[PDB]
Amino acid sequence: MKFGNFLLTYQPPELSQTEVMKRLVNLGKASEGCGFDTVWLLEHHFTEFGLLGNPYVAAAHLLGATETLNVGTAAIVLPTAHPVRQAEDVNLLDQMSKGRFRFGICRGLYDKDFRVFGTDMDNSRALMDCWYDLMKEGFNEGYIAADNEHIKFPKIQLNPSAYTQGGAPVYVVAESASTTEWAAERGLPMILSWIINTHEKKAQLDLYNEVATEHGYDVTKIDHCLSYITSVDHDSNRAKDICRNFLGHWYDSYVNATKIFRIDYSYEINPVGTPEECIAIIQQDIDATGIDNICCGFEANGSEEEIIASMKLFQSDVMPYLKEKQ
Template sequence: MRFGVFLPVAGFPGYGQGETLTAAVDAAVAAERAGFDDVWIAEHHFMTYGLCPSATTLAAYVLGRTERVGVGTAVSVLSSQHPVALAEQAALLDQVSGGRFRLGVGRGGPWVDLEVFGTGLDRFENGFEEGLDLLVAALGQGRVAADGDTFRFREVELVPRPGRPMRPTVAATSPGTARTAGARGLPLLLGLHVGDQDKAALVAAHAEAALAHGHDPAGAAHVAAGVAYVADTTAEAVAVLRASLPRWLGPGLAGHRPVDGRAHVPRDAGEYADLLCRLHPVGSPGHCADTMLATIERTGIRHLILLVEGAGDPALTRRAIARLGAEVLPAVRSAC
């Protein structure tokens, strides 16, 4: 079993951006102290849902502030950056951290980022697989060239090369992306917006594609994200998050702006908060442990990463991390 914390670097009202970034780093340090195995940092642009525009940059800083935990990106958005440049960053962090860096990548969305960074909507809609293949080749072979629809360049050598074989984890919200990862033997990162049944279906789609392409699906170290908050009683924990989450989710989700004319209607923040509390380990220590064990049993995923910023208060976040480490993780580990 592996357990991590997932840090979107959530922009709650009432806190300055510097305070929020500092609080995220403090949460990462607290997670190491509490016995978590890793820390995963999200990338977002031009929105308060997440205040980190470069997950690799903040991961580098967190690697320097910690000694033991793995530090990863959940995720670096592949549609808005060059895959070989991302491979260079990943290799660099792998080398200087002694192998503690983890790379997670995703397609992203049809957002204004594509316009600002000049990659365009076609990269999002049609270029993901080509970019993913270049990223995997650069990290695995150390040399890479391209003659595709999106990328064309002569062969180059990756400098530095990773200190070990690196295989990115791929965020998937659809069976198509799960199959894309499975065909390449890459593990999945499954989001917090769906429950165990949907996660299990994506794992099954991945396994089918993996087998068809000669990969052993049992060897895929999938990662599942969820929200976590622990209090003395489940009612207390749920009340805290139902009050706090909409203050973040409302303005945060409204920050998604399509690059084209397609309509985008954000989720209702209150309903989404209720859903997250129902799906994930939000409750007493016993309830949290039981919920995590149920996810492990239903999905087969043995690496859970927990969004711990939901209370919207850095002190409460650090307290929840400490309680999860002391009162929940040992119970889950001992039962697995």
């Protein structure tokens, strides 16, 4: 069983930016000791919803500070940055860390990003697909060239070379059936949403498998991840109140981010409550999906001390009991 810790770098009303950044640093560094094998970093721009706009740079910092910890993006908004610069970033991370970087990607949800970075949100799907083909070409061949409707540039040598054959492992946040299909055609693992229920997760993987299988991939070896909002406490209601209060503030921040220029019942389908309750919810999903990579976000928990406390309780009282699908 593998365990991932998600860091959103979200700024709740009670913390300053500087406090948020210090916590990002500390939480990253404490993850491995809490039994997490990977730290996942979300990208966000210009709002308190998430202060980290450059996860490749934050990943570099965390990877530099560790030895065996893997660090990934969940996820880079693919379309809003030059694909060649992103390939250089990924190969540098791959090389510096000696293969510990995990490249999670997505289409992009916020118009503000497209607006500022000069991209057409209307074409996010095409752009993500295009950029991925260019980066993969660089990862595989050591050179990249483009002459298409989205971009054009001469053939260049891409430095440095990929450390991992084929480039750092890619992961996809699939927000649509079409994204699920796109991932399946390339045999790429998905990072499943924490706001869909077991049935929906199983359906999504069923759609995925159909495609992947058709392509020849062995669906049993793809590293899909289950994502969760996590709050562990021997006092069930306490965990739940904290979670609900937090999501209040957070959802508002989300809406605000969508306009600069579901989540509610969430708690019921996430490991929020006693460790026993957490075991039950997660095992239900494992049982239905066969996934063995559990990714959890603990920021809703409070102060850095409370967050760490929650991480440690998950570690001691949840982790050991989860079992791979029978």
